[PDB]
Amino acid sequence: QMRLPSADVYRFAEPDSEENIIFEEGIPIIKAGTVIKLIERLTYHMYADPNFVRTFLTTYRSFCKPQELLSLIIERFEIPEPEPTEADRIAIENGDQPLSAELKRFRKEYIQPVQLRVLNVCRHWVEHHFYDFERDAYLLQRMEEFIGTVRGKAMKKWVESITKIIQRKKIAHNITFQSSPPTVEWHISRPGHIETFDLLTLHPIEIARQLTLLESDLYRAVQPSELVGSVWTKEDKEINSPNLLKMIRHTTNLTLWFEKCIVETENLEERVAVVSRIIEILQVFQELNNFNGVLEVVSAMNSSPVYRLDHTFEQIPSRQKKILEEAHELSEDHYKKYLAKLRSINPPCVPFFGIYLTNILKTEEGNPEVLKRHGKELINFSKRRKVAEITGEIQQYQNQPYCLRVESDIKRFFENLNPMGNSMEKEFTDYLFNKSLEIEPRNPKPLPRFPKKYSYPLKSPGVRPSNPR
């Protein structure tokens, strides 16, 4: 075999045991283990683990402080070189150069793999988890000191590179497409007339597009640190999960806007135009794989004020009800169909984050932080692998960008949307419901009539794109 360093001069040489490391039942998968053992596997020398580094760097903060994580990998990096074999000694003692057969093998199979993987952890740590350094200046100096004193011509390539990445991170993403984006569609409102922009005056195709761009961005901005430790459900949610919340609020605001648009259009016929146009937007959303968008409409249609408007939905064409039903069925039975759908589309897409939040939360508090074996309290790594499996999935859908041209004025119209105004959730919500009672009263009270409110034609230009440019 190949002799490892002495466990008395290198802690990461201590043998595995049912007391410091548990394997799951074709690389090994760690179920539980000590911080020391966990870090040994994070940089093992036998095999590669595509997810270990990300899983670890994403979740370690609950069971290990940053300052200690660094000390430990530096400790792991400092592998003591093995004493000469008997042959080496014999040669040296005769004034000859030792062959060093084992020493060379020990470097090729243990030292290099280990040291390279420790540097890989340093590189990723600095690259995608820099906040750790932004909150601990000393932590950064130690890293710089460490990376900057790694001697040897071997590691130089990488050491040199990490040093640069670190600096680049203190000082302060373009996209290439095969085909170019489709032409921006305009309806009644013309370019540069933000005073007229509105649900029925903007092209429905373009409303779905600009909102899909807007929503895709909000999705791509959520960081894992806003999800680990169920921090978006705690008192400091505003501080720890600002991107997540910003994204969830946009969804809510748009849902409420749709609801407001529907119920404030008192005239039956005009309201049917309003509802129909929104279902058309839903249709484009589905085409663009904007599942988040699809659900905002569904939620609007299923809210208390809109759901009960039977006289309106009765007059909705047969084809559109079917569209809205398929859409609604997505969420039915715990999002069974939705999950199937998302697993099968060809991104770019904008998933619905609610599913992920619920899974992360249940996983977080349905699994112990540690598992005990013979008294020892091992870190429950399987619980972390599960949370990182989710953050990983989320990140996979964050890579693909939409080939759509942004239209500034339309983006702004939707960013400054504020259905609620100065009202509080309850007040606004009740206002919407009363409006529902006013436009379509409860039985046996008969349905009244209201005067039209729009002066422009209500005919939709449709959702099939035009091809002139």
Partner 1 sequence: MTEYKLVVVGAGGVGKSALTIQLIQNHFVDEYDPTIEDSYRKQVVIDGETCLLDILDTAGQEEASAMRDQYMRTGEGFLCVFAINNTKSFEDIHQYREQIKRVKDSDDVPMVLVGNKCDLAARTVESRQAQDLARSYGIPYIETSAKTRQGVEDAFYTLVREIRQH
Binding residues among 31-90 for partner 1 as defined by CB under 8 A: 31, 45-48, 50-51
C-alpha 414/C-alpha 207 separation (Å) is: 9
- Contact call for residue 308 and partner 1 (CB under 8 A): yes
Binds partner 1 by CB under 8 A, chosen from 298, 327, 404, 463:
298
Q: Give the interface segment with partner 1, choosing from 78-86, 87-95, 142-150, 169-177 (CB under 8 A).
A: 169-177
Taking the complex as a whole, the smallest distance from the CB of residue 354 to partner 1 amounts, in Å, to 4
Closest CB to partner 1 among 165 and 458?
165
290: Cα separation from own chain's centroid: 15
C-alpha 107/C-alpha 87 separation (Å) is: 18
Taking the complex as a whole, the smallest distance from the CB of residue 452 to partner 1 amounts, in Å, to 28
Contacts with 457 (C-beta within 8 Å, 6 or more apart), sequence order: 188
Binds partner 1 by CB under 8 A, chosen from 3, 170, 249, 311:
249
Closest CB to partner 1 among 115 and 283?
115
DSSP annotation string for 217-235: HHHHT--GGGTGGGGGGST
End-to-end CA distance of the chain: 71
Taking the complex as a whole, the smallest distance from the CB of residue 58 to partner 1 amounts, in Å, to 14
- Contact call for residue 426 and partner 1 (CB under 8 A): yes
- Contact call for residue 1 and partner 1 (CB under 8 A): no
* CB 231, CB 61: distance < 8 Å: no
The DSSP code for 379 is: E
Binds partner 1 by CB under 8 A, chosen from 55, 212, 225, 230:
230
Kindly list the distances between the CA atom of residue 179 and the CA atoms of 28, 125, 350, in Å, as whole numbers in the listed order: 44, 36, 21
Binds partner 1 by CB under 8 A, chosen from 240, 251, 283, 312:
251
Q: Give the interface segment with partner 1, choosing from 64-72, 74-82, 161-169, 458-466 (CB under 8 A).
A: 161-169
Q: Which of residues 110-129 bind partner 1 (CB under 8 A)?
A: 112-113, 116-117, 119-120, 123
* CB 76, CB 35: distance < 8 Å: no
Q: Which of residues 344-363 bind partner 1 (CB under 8 A)?
A: 344-347, 354, 357-363
The Cβ of residue 250 has, within 10 Å, a number of other Cβ atoms equal to 20
Nearest of 27, 49, 20, 32 to residue 117 by alpha carbon: 49
Closest CB to partner 1 among 103 and 458?
103
Q: Give the interface segment with partner 1, choosing from 71-79, 85-93, 105-113, 272-280 (CB under 8 A).
A: 105-113
Closest CB to partner 1 among 100 and 120?
120
Taking the complex as a whole, the smallest distance from the CB of residue 399 to partner 1 amounts, in Å, to 5
Taking the complex as a whole, the smallest distance from the CB of residue 451 to partner 1 amounts, in Å, to 29
139: Cα separation from own chain's centroid: 27
- Contact call for residue 299 and partner 1 (CB under 8 A): yes
Binds partner 1 by CB under 8 A, chosen from 41, 260, 384, 386:
386
C-alpha 138/C-alpha 147 separation (Å) is: 14
Count helices and strands (H / E) in the chain: 21, 4
Q: Give the interface segment with partner 1, choosing from 89-97, 251-259, 274-282, 446-454 (CB under 8 A).
A: 251-259
Site map 312..341 versus partner 1, x via CB under 8 A: -------------------x--x-------
Amino acid present at 172:
A
- Contact call for residue 418 and partner 1 (CB under 8 A): no
Q: Give the interface segment with partner 1, choosing from 34-42, 151-159, 204-212, 270-278 (CB under 8 A).
A: 151-159
Secondary structure of residue 32 in the 3-state scheme: strand
C-alpha 393/C-alpha 56 separation (Å) is: 16
Handedness of CA 315, 321, 323, 325 (dihedral sign): positive
The DSSP code for 11 is: G
The DSSP code for 108 is: I
* CB 232, CB 226: distance < 8 Å: yes
Strands of the 370-373 sheet, one edge to the other: 21-23, 30-33, 376-380, 370-373
Taking the complex as a whole, the smallest distance from the CB of residue 436 to partner 1 amounts, in Å, to 11
Closest CB to partner 1 among 108 and 311?
108
C-alpha 250/C-alpha 256 separation (Å) is: 10
Number of residues that bind partner 1 (CB under 8 A): 84
Site map 362..381 versus partner 1, x via CB under 8 A: xx-xxx---x----------
